[PDB]
Design a protein around this ligand. Sequence first.
Ligand SMILES: CC(=O)N[C@@H]1[C@@H](O)[C@H](O[C@@H]2O[C@H](CO)[C@@H](O)[C@H](O)[C@H]2NC(C)=O)[C@@H](CO)O[C@H]1O
Length: 326
Amino acid sequence: LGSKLLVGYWHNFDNGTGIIKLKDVSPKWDVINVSFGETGGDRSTVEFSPVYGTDADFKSDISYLKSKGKKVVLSIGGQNGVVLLPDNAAKDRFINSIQSLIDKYGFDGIDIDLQSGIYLNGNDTNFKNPTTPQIVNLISAIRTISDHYGPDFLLSMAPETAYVQGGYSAYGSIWGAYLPIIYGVKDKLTYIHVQHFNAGSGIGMDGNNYNQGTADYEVAMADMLLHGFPVGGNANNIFPALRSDQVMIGLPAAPAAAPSGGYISPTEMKKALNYIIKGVPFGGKYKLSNQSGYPAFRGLMSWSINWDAKNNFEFSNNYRTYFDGL
Ligand SMILES: CC(=O)N[C@@H]1[C@@H](O)[C@H](O[C@@H]2O[C@H](CO)[C@@H](O)[C@H](O)[C@H]2NC(C)=O)[C@@H](CO)O[C@H]1O
């Protein structure tokens, strides 16, 4: 797996941007996050059927991409997905259903993209030792699934900012709720790409409020994971830095890909990237924690491959060229 990646979400559905068959996806994407595995009534058995092709056709298309060095990952959740693991029985249905899908289609890994049903209960105060069943069981399930496959099994996640960087402000309910998940699976985590969009403002480690879709915001939010940060206003409760090679930034491919804002122009984003990766500043207000950069910063994720194709391939062309050209 390359050192500077483009990870793109792939719509297993037509939302007006159309379907792109797998072999027609631009080769500039290194990893394709197939979107999404969702659930029915029991909210724990994950299901997936391809939007085009026989099952065998879809599996063959995945095999073709893998033969070209690409990774194809099953994303679980999304805007509409609901996964609830209140007890061990539910956890086991989740594990078995996902393993079955990985086996059936030959997915290279899984992406945790759960955007509901995740809360730190009252008294759940320690990110190293979570107590809320949903969180404890997700961690257990993720570790179990990862340990069911070989060394190249890919694990990613795409939490919204409140769940991660929001932990700088509060630790409870959704605030910081992915922190125990991240920590609990860190030794199996390939990378995390927080969604830096549909996100309003975010507080940086300088205590300043930043607006989504600005270079300063991208640097401030990424730096939290690159450097680590105190949780919930408690100086003695530090969330440790991830490896730089585990940190990505998730961005909208086009303005319309994130209807509540967050899109950033490649010109502005390259300022943020040069600062993050090389410590080369751009006159921004945010001061990077390590002023000579985090060279192993892993790259960019986008919602989505489909949106990118409808927007002159702006995201894929701009950022592939940027990363290739370093
Ligand atoms: C990274 C990620 O998965 N983001 C979430 C997406 O699911 C969401 O896109 C929306 O997904 C729905 C299915 O879950 C689609 O029905 C819907 O059309 C789609 N919205 C758009 C504008 O493409 C994106 C939207 O920015 O953010 C998260 O909510």
